[PDB]
Enzyme design. Structure first.
Site, PDB file in Angstrom:
ATOM      1  N   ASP A 155       0.821  -1.204   0.000  1.00  0.00           N
ATOM      2  CA  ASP A 155       0.000   0.000   0.000  1.00  0.00           C
ATOM      3  C   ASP A 155       0.852   1.249   0.000  1.00  0.00           C
ATOM      4  O   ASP A 155       0.470   2.261   0.582  1.00  0.00           O
ATOM      5  CB  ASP A 155      -0.970   0.010   1.180  1.00  0.00           C
ATOM      6  CG  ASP A 155      -2.245   0.775   0.903  1.00  0.00           C
ATOM      7  OD1 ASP A 155      -2.968   1.052   1.878  1.00  0.00           O
ATOM      8  OD2 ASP A 155      -2.531   1.078  -0.267  1.00  0.00           O
ATOM      9  N   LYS A 157       1.924   4.692  -0.957  1.00  0.00           N
ATOM     10  CA  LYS A 157       1.312   5.873  -1.550  1.00  0.00           C
ATOM     11  C   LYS A 157       1.537   7.035  -0.573  1.00  0.00           C
ATOM     12  O   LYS A 157       1.785   6.801   0.609  1.00  0.00           O
ATOM     13  CB  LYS A 157      -0.187   5.661  -1.812  1.00  0.00           C
ATOM     14  CG  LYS A 157      -0.995   5.294  -0.600  1.00  0.00           C
ATOM     15  CD  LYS A 157      -2.431   5.050  -0.955  1.00  0.00           C
ATOM     16  CE  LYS A 157      -3.273   4.697   0.256  1.00  0.00           C
ATOM     17  NZ  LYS A 157      -4.680   4.579  -0.150  1.00  0.00           N
ATOM     18  N   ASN A 160       0.058   7.299   3.053  1.00  0.00           N
ATOM     19  CA  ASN A 160       0.458   6.362   4.088  1.00  0.00           C
ATOM     20  C   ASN A 160       1.813   6.677   4.686  1.00  0.00           C
ATOM     21  O   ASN A 160       2.323   5.896   5.498  1.00  0.00           O
ATOM     22  CB  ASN A 160       0.420   4.932   3.548  1.00  0.00           C
ATOM     23  CG  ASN A 160      -0.985   4.386   3.464  1.00  0.00           C
ATOM     24  OD1 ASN A 160      -1.925   4.990   3.983  1.00  0.00           O
ATOM     25  ND2 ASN A 160      -1.134   3.232   2.829  1.00  0.00           N
ATOM     26  N   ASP A 173      -0.399   2.227   8.136  1.00  0.00           N
ATOM     27  CA  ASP A 173      -1.453   1.450   7.502  1.00  0.00           C
ATOM     28  C   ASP A 173      -0.877   0.190   6.889  1.00  0.00           C
ATOM     29  O   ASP A 173      -0.400   0.191   5.746  1.00  0.00           O
ATOM     30  CB  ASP A 173      -2.278   2.259   6.496  1.00  0.00           C
ATOM     31  CG  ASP A 173      -3.582   1.546   6.117  1.00  0.00           C
ATOM     32  OD1 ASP A 173      -4.525   2.197   5.592  1.00  0.00           O
ATOM     33  OD2 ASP A 173      -3.670   0.325   6.355  1.00  0.00           O
ATOM     34  N   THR A 190      -3.997   0.837  -4.308  1.00  0.00           N
ATOM     35  CA  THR A 190      -4.645   1.986  -4.921  1.00  0.00           C
ATOM     36  C   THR A 190      -4.312   2.042  -6.412  1.00  0.00           C
ATOM     37  O   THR A 190      -3.158   1.805  -6.792  1.00  0.00           O
ATOM     38  CB  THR A 190      -4.181   3.254  -4.210  1.00  0.00           C
ATOM     39  OG1 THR A 190      -4.513   3.135  -2.817  1.00  0.00           O
ATOM     40  CG2 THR A 190      -4.852   4.495  -4.784  1.00  0.00           C
TER      41      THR A 190
HETATM   42  N1  3AB Z   1      -0.104   7.261  13.527  1.00  0.00           N
HETATM   43  C1  3AB Z   1      -0.763   8.365  13.173  1.00  0.00           C
HETATM   44  O1  3AB Z   1      -0.493   9.500  13.636  1.00  0.00           O
HETATM   45  C2  3AB Z   1      -1.880   8.225  12.164  1.00  0.00           C
HETATM   46  C3  3AB Z   1      -2.727   9.293  11.907  1.00  0.00           C
HETATM   47  C4  3AB Z   1      -3.716   9.185  10.942  1.00  0.00           C
HETATM   48  C5  3AB Z   1      -3.856   8.011  10.221  1.00  0.00           C
HETATM   49  C6  3AB Z   1      -3.006   6.933  10.454  1.00  0.00           C
HETATM   50  N2  3AB Z   1      -3.122   5.769   9.717  1.00  0.00           N
HETATM   51  C7  3AB Z   1      -2.024   7.044  11.442  1.00  0.00           C
END
Ligand code: 3AB
Ligand code: 3AB
Length: 339
Positions: A155, A157, A160, A173, A190
């Site tokens: 994933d 991108k 992330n 993620d 994606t």
């Molecule tokens: N670890 C993080 O600060 C965070 C924030 C928003 C989305 C995600 N996946 C992680």
């Protein structure tokens, strides 16, 4: 060098011990106060929370078990948590706690207040080659680590990749990450970042991550991805074609690296040859990169996000604040026994 071999052998030993005996049930929901929604999706959300006793902030990913089932993400969610609790690398967001209740799965992560690379890239337009190279080097090392553990990330991108207080990357993620010896088959990722062999429904391997790195580097350096189009089918036609156009401002070295990462024949793609990651690390586009200094976080970053403190949410956007309820009855208990 034997130094890298011994590093990776210890990394695998430590990963496998945690992989074989995963942690479970290490906090509970009422240990935390809910602060703000940081992101949403079709089966979950990420919430800024504060631990009520220590005062520490975390990013809590909440997945609705019933929606995970409906959208055929059971094994993927089990992968995500089992992998994250077992890995340890400077550019991977750390999983601090996990638990489940009657309705939801919870993964409590370190909070990275600098926000997504995506936002910074769109705000600035495009990154200079040195700036893109600084982030790319971190991804190269992270994939060297993950692939050595037989993990495919799947994933990559800009959304992330979070930017931390030192300006370094934290990959977040792991919803599509999987431990794979050999090949795997699931259609996921994606559209703009999918390798041809995913689009064509083949059994694919870690080479898909190296393809995605080519897409990421191109997008960082150009400001837009290489195979853009309005509908996914038109994106896929471009991906499989074997054709990419480069902006004239790209250096020759960058174009050369990208032709070898965006190689439609997976058996010829950099990262998937006999020399493995070293074809990338030794490429002239990376000649100025001190790989050890990047790993040790000794390089001054291109950009330090602006934020006021560990509770600042300014680098994330605003979402409807929706109720999160916990059913009085257990849902999907069997499916998520191992979580
Ligand atoms: N670890 C993080 O600060 C965070 C924030 C928003 C989305 C995600 N996946 C992680
Ligand atoms: N129910 C909720 O939305 C929630 C989220 C985070 C922390 C707590 N205690 C509750």
């Amino acid at each position: 060098q034997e130094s890298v071999k011994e590093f990776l052998a210890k990394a695998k030993e430590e990963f496998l011990k945690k992989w074989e005996s995963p942690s479970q049930n290490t906090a509970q929901l009422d240990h935390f106060d809910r602060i703000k929604t940081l992101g949403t999706g079709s089966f979950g959300r990420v919430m800024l929370v504060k631990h009520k006793e220590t005062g520490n902030h975390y990013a809590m990913k909440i997945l609705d078990k019933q929606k995970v089932v409906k959208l055929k993400q059971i094994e993927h969610t089990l992968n995500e948590k089992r992998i994250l609790q077992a890995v340890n690398f400077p550019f991977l967001v750390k999983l601090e706690f996990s638990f489940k209740d009657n309705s939801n799965l919870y993964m409590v992560m370190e909070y990275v207040p600098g926000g997504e690379m995506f936002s910074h890239l769109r705000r600035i337009g495009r990154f200079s080659e040195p700036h893109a190279r600084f982030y790319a080097a971190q991804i190269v090392l992270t994939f060297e680590y993950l692939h050595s553990l037989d993990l495919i990330y799947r994933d990559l991108k800009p959304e992330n990749l979070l930017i931390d207080q030192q300006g370094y990357i934290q990959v977040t993620d792991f919803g599509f990450a999987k431990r794979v010896k050999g090949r795997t088959w699931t259609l996921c990722g994606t559209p703009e970042y999918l390798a041809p062999e995913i689009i064509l429904s083949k059994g694919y391997n870690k080479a898909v991550d190296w393809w995605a790195l080519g897409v990421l580097i191109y997008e960082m350096a150009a400001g837009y991805p290489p195979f853009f189009a309005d509908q996914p089918i038109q994106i896929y036609e471009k991906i499989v074609s074997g054709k990419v156009r480069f902006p004239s401002h790209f250096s020759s070295d960058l174009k050369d690296l990208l032709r070898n990462l965006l190689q439609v024949d997976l058996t010829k793609r950099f990262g998937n040859l006999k020399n493995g990651v070293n074809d990338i690390k030794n490429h002239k586009w990376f000649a100025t990169t001190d790989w050890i200094a990047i790993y040790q976080r000794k390089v001054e970053a291109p950009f330090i996000p602006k934020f006021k403190g560990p509770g600042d949410t300014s680098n994330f956007d605003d979402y409807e604040e929706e109720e999160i309820r916990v059913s009085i009855n257990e849902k999907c208990g069997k499916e998520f026994t191992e979580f």
